[PDB]
Design a protein around this ligand. Structure first.
Ligand SMILES: [Zn+2]
Ligand SMILES: [Zn+2]
Ligand SMILES: [Zn+2]
Ligand SMILES: [Zn+2]
Lengths: 331, 304, 218, 263
């Protein structure tokens, strides 16, 4: 797509902790497989979108539990998922309370954030304690976006929630299909005609080591069991002390960016194109791969659009998944 | 004209009737769209039936409740459960309470039992349709004779799994049955055991075949007792349901049927968009003018 | 109703670190208890994509000289790569290798006298507890300050909250100087001047906002 | 099983100015130090693999891929094909004027996908670790920064280390790459000792980085400028449509012609 995308993205993951998480349709029980692919999901989402954040709610026993708050580093989330392997999964879920906690945190994120909730939902009895069409009207008006990945069935309420809030609903066959669905929700989904297109004020703090062998330095502890920090990253608004970048400013409200973290997600904006895939021999006067200078010992030859060079299957998967550019069009 | 009429050999043989066309139209599909299973085998390998003639047999009602429980745990968005008689639904939902079953069915979905009031049935239907849309799971269990299954139709997500409990035989009624059967022996030529099977199957397949509206609707439709596998009773279901009744599905267990339901719903909850139909189960403007399509439509329809 | 009291209490109990903070601020005579418990509740067609191509890297000194050098260099390197492959002779003189081992030895060039990181681990534990109390307290102080500070919010109620923030800031600096005198006069180490950098930047933003708003008076 | 992928920045203009300088150190000792590093890497273990790429100004042609004079035999064949390939490359050459600054993004792209296909070649018993040496001697063009970061993040994902020996001038993007991927950066202070720098710093593999005491990491500048005036920024304004850095606040966003909502 050559369309607008939601690139600052407070996503918020609601997992079941239902009775139906313990069912053994997957190769381990559904809790374990779901949680493993969420570990992979947090990994690839922070690997691809650096500005954004994640928060994890386990929904358990008709109540909702904010298990890990909305933050932007994979260590705390994957640590909490390694903890949450050990849980119990007792009771029926509650879609009302989980969407209420996600709404309560996602009211006051600024308007340019595509505020997104991902409900990995298994069971069928959606045991709410109040009316859940007024929530869907509120979340429609609060311009949030909720997408539900479903297990074993299609449920009408999750269908109405997905088609009305703006999201997308999907049901799971396999391990591989479920990986394809979570990979589909890694990428930034396109925006509606409703979300604000603002201009967030940003800060670009340089790295600062202990200045000249600590000749008149500023010895600090940290800012969020810490040692004595000699130097590091400052802030251009409040002049505090941060170890890691990118981190939202804990005492100002500025967002702090190193700016390859803007360059880590530039491929969404000037995207790739399609490779013309042709299996047969077909006029090939360029026998060797323009990717890595090797022969084409199979019957799959892939030719670009603009330069129209030659690529094999290995160069196809590598260019379209990782390098994200044609090596010909750079030249 | 009806969606179910089977067999068509008997409506000229009752109505003093000689038609021009006796036609049956085969369900041509690009996607399985339905699966009927005959769950005629308990989980204890108890033969599921209703041979007792409404005087309760305990283990068969136990296996009916086990079927409803596990099919509740699998199916989304509303399960419709047709019993035989209101005395039998009365007795069954009685002995689903003293026996510890019905609270578990409550834990999975919300029941709406039927009564023979004209207004209480309408309120139970209205709450059943407001519970298939406000998140939770709803399950309407009724009688396969009354007005619940005559007009009140169950569309895309109101009934996913029509559970036909038992074979519906008119058992309560008097010598009107014996006398109409003596008449159909004498002055028409239609047998006893032919007309009873015809009447039972037109009621059963009448109440089953309401779940499906279009090609983009999917309805699990289970038949729960062993008698629907016995050739004459299966032979009088319509052709568009016998076409999708596989010999493996014939006489499944409870749990084999539950696993077939799971595989059914998972293979049939994916994006089945309009672009998957223009070949097989749909026709455009210009897909009609081809004479190959005319040969296809010659091959679909048949007569009796 | 005595609700708030019961809340701030229940918290202080459950949260002893917060209790600490509450003492270090209220009991320390920096602010009043009420204040503390009070405020503690669409087609995207890019126009100029060349700005994306050479990104936020600053402009390096890139002055390739006149295109005569292109022709000269093409001539010299087309002549250069004709006659080729000496492998024994040309590659290394041994004196260059000896000077390279001299450099990569730990007293020469490219060994920067780096990865030293001389630390001051003398009295670790109780000073770490002092700094935990101090960074919690100054984090709460600068939390309130930079939370109300950023947008000027040009009315009289927010300016009054800013004046209360100014009073809390000055008494916070007094309490920080008192804590530095009571702490660092034990064994003469452990510069606490980072907290003084943070509070000095609060002091500086307060005076700079004061001069800015006095310029914005008329 | 290891895979060194040397990349030699064969700028004909730069080494031409180096050979008209009449110094001691020309391109011949550069490519000879490359081949001695390659034969040393194949020499350290039987299972090691080698691939040597040469970024020209307009093409990323690979260099690589009996015993007459006493070497090991496969070292002799590899040296013969590298020598004949640089003689076919540099002598038979061209001249153009709009594109005369060297490239490094494309050769790194070929190295990334080459390591991908050679990791598909690996069977289930053994496992391949990999790195890319970059021997840079020219000035990198700014114009491919959009491309260049991408290959770094590919080497971030594919767990390929990146090392760099820069010869004449420092390079911010390449020390940036060697900071991101976990590799190593080194600016040589005297040219003709190049091989002895490589055989101690850049020859040792991943399970010898942790054993050897190496020259320390230089501090990496995360400088950032606007797309407006190219000047250094400590606080900037970044759009959420275009995702571009502006220095001073402006009404109408120039990078994507955004009808900016004003509050
Ligand atoms: Zn700040
Ligand atoms: Zn191309
Ligand atoms: Zn290839
Ligand atoms: Zn913009």
């Amino acid at each position: 797509g050559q369309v607008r995308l939601g690139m600052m993205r407070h996503l918020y993951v609601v997992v079941d902790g239902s009775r139906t998480m313990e069912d053994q349709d997957l190769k381990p029980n559904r809790l374990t497989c779901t949680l493993k692919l969420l570990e992979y999901f947090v990994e690839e989402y922070f690997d691809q979108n650096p500005i954004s954040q994640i928060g994890i709610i386990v929904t358990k026993s008709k109540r909702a539990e904010k298990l890990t708050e909305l933050s932007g580093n994979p260590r705390k989330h994957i640590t909490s998922l390694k903890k949450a392997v050990d849980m119990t999964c007792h009771g029926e879920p509650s879609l009302y309370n989980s969407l209420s906690i996600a709404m309560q945190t996602l009211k006051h994120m600024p308007g340019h954030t595509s505020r997104e909730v991902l409900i990995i939902f298994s069971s069928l009895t959606t045991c709410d304690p109040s009316n859940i069409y007024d929530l869907i009207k509120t979340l429609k008006a609060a311009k949030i976006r909720v997408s539900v990945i479903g297990l074993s069935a299609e449920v009408r309420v999750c269908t109405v929630l997905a088609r009305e809030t703006g999201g997308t609903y999907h049901v799971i066959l396999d391990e591989s299909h479920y990986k394809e669905l979570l990979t589909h929700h890694v990428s930034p989904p396109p925006a509606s005609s409703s979300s604000e297109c603002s201009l967030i004020r940003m800060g670009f703090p340089q790295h600062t080591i202990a200045s000249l062998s600590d000749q008149d330095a500023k010895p600090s502890f940290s800012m969020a069991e810490p040692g004595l920090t000699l130097g590091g990253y400052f802030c251009p608004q409040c002049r505090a002390k941060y170890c890691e970048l990118p981190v939202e400013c804990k005492i100002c409200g500025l967002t702090l960016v190193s700016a390859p973290h803007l360059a880590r997600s530039y491929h969404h904006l000037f995207p790739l194109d399609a490779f013309q895939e042709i299996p047969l021999e077909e006029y090939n006067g360029e026998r060797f791969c323009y990717g890595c200078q090797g022969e084409l010992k199979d019957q799959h030859v892939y030719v670009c659009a603009v330069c129209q060079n030659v690529f094999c299957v290995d160069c196809d998967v590598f260019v379209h998944d990782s390098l994200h550019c044609c090596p010909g069009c750079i030249h | 004209t009806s969606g179910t009429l089977s067999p068509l050999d008997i409506y000229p043989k009752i109505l003093d009737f000689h038609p021009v066309t006796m036609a049956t139209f085969t369900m041509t599909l690009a996607r399985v769209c339905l699966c009927p299973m005959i769950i005629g085998r308990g989980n204890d390998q108890v033969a599921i039936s209703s041979k007792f003639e409404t005087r309760e047999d305990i283990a068969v009602i136990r296996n009916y409740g086990n079927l409803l429980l596990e099919m509740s745990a699998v199916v989304p968005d509303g399960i419709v459960a047709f019993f035989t008689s209101y005395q039998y639904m009365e007795s069954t939902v009685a002995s689903w309470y003293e026996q510890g079953i019905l609270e578990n069915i409550q834990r999975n979905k919300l029941l709406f039992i039927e009564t023979q009031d004209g207004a209480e049935t309408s309120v139970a239907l209205e709450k059943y349709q407001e519970a298939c849309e406000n998140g939770r799971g709803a399950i309407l269990l009724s009688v396969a004779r009354g007005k619940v299954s005559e007009g009140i139709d169950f569309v895309h997500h109101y009934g996913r799994a029509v559970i036909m409990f038992g074979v519906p035989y008119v058992y309560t009624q008097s010598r009107i049955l014996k006398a109409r059967l003596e008449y159909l022996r004498d002055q028409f030529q239609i047998r006893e055991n032919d007309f009873l099977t015809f009447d039972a199957m037109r009621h059963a397949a009448q109440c089953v075949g309401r779940a499906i509206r279009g090609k983009t609707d999917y309805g699990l439709m289970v038949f729960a007792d062993k008698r629907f596998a016995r050739g004459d009773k299966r032979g009088k279901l319509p052709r568009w349901i016998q076409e999708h009744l596989t010999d493996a599905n014939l006489n499944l267990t409870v749990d084999e049927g539950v696993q077939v339901a799971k595989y059914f719903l998972r293979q049939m909850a994916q994006p089945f968009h309009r672009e998957d139909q223009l070949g097989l189960s749909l026709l455009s403007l210009e897909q009609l003018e081809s004479e190959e399509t005319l040969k296809r439509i010659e091959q679909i329809a048949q007569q009796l | 109703a005595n609700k708030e009291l019961e809340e701030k209490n229940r918290m202080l109990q459950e949260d002893p670190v917060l209790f600490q903070l509450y003492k270090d601020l209220v009991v320390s005579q920096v602010i009043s208890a009420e204040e503390f418990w009070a405020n503690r509740l669409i087609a995207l067609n890019l126009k100029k994509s060349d700005r994306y191509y050479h990104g936020p890297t600053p402009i390096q000194s890139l002055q390739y000289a006149t295109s005569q050098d292109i022709i000269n260099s093409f001539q010299s390197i087309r002549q250069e790569m004709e006659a080729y492959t000496p492998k024994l002779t040309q590659v290394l003189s041994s004196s260059a290798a000896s000077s390279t081992i001299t450099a990569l030895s730990p007293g020469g060039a490219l060994m920067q006298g780096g990865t030293q990181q001389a630390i001051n681990q003398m009295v670790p534990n109780d000073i770490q507890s002092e700094l935990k109390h101090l960074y919690v307290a100054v984090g709460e102080l600068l939390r309130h300050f930079w939370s109300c500070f950023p947008v000027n919010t040009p009315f009289l109620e927010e300016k009054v909250v800013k004046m209360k923030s100014n009073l809390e800031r000055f008494q916070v600096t007094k309490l920080c100087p008192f804590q530095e005198k009571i702490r660092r006069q034990y064994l003469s180490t452990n510069l606490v001047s980072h907290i003084e950098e943070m509070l000095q930047t609060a002091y500086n933003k307060l005076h700079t906002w004061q001069s800015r708003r006095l310029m914005k008076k008329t | 099983l290891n895979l060194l992928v040397i990349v030699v920045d064969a700028n004909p203009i730069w080494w031409g100015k180096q050979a008209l300088k009449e110094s001691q150190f020309t391109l011949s000792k550069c490519i000879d130090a490359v081949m001695v590093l390659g034969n040393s890497h194949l020499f350290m273990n039987r299972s090691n693999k080698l691939a040597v790429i040469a970024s020209h100004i307009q093409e990323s042609r690979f260099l690589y891929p009996g015993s007459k004079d006493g070497k090991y035999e496969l070292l002799t064949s590899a040296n013969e094909v590298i020598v004949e390939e640089i003689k076919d490359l540099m002598t038979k050459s061209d001249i153009k004027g709009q594109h005369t600054e060297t490239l490094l993004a494309g050769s790194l792209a070929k190295a990334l996908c080459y390591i991908h296909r050679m990791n598909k070649e690996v069977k289930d018993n053994q496992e391949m670790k990999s790195r890319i040496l970059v021997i840079k001697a020219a000035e990198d063009s700014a114009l491919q920064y959009m491309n260049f970061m991408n290959v770094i993040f590919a080497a971030q994902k594919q767990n390929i280390l990146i090392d760099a020996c820069v010869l004449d001038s420092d390079s911010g993007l390449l020390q940036q790459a060697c900071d991101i991927t976990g590799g190593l950066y080194l600016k040589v202070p005297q040219m003709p000792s190049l091989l002895q720098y490589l055989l101690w710093v850049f020859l040792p593999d991943q399970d010898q980085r942790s054993q050897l005491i190496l020259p320390p990491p230089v501090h990496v500048d995360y400088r950032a400028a606007c797309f407006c005036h190219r000047n250094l920024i400590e606080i900037g304004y970044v759009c959420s449509v275009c995702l571009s850095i502006f220095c001073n606040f402006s009404p109408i966003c120039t990078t994507c012609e955004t009808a900016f909502k004003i509050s």
